Amino acid sequence: QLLREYGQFCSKINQALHGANLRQDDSVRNLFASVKSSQSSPIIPGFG
């Protein structure tokens, strides 16, 4: 009941964390897409 009077506040904190988590997911996807190679040779035992 005491928290309810504050109105917006907890919502703003939750929204900011949600946005940061989405940004981290976007960063992981971009880095891994660049990491992937269009053509690769299959790994075999005794490779190299």
Binding site: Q39, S41, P42, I44
Partner: protein, 48 residues
């Protein structure tokens, strides 16, 4: 696949395409000047 023989397998494209990658880089932020006296007092002498 890698080849045990001296000849080596090569993967080469028989077709080509043109694609456009769009990138935006921010170089500037909005320039804001605030009248601190007006904002704090709202032009009231007692506040001044």
């Amino acid at each position: 696949d890698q080849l045990n023989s001296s000849y080596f397998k090569l993967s080469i494209p028989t077709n080509f395409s043109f694609g456009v990658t769009q990138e935006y880089i921010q170089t500037t932020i909005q320039k804001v000047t605030v009248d601190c006296k007006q904002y704090v007092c709202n032009g009231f002498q007692k506040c001044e």
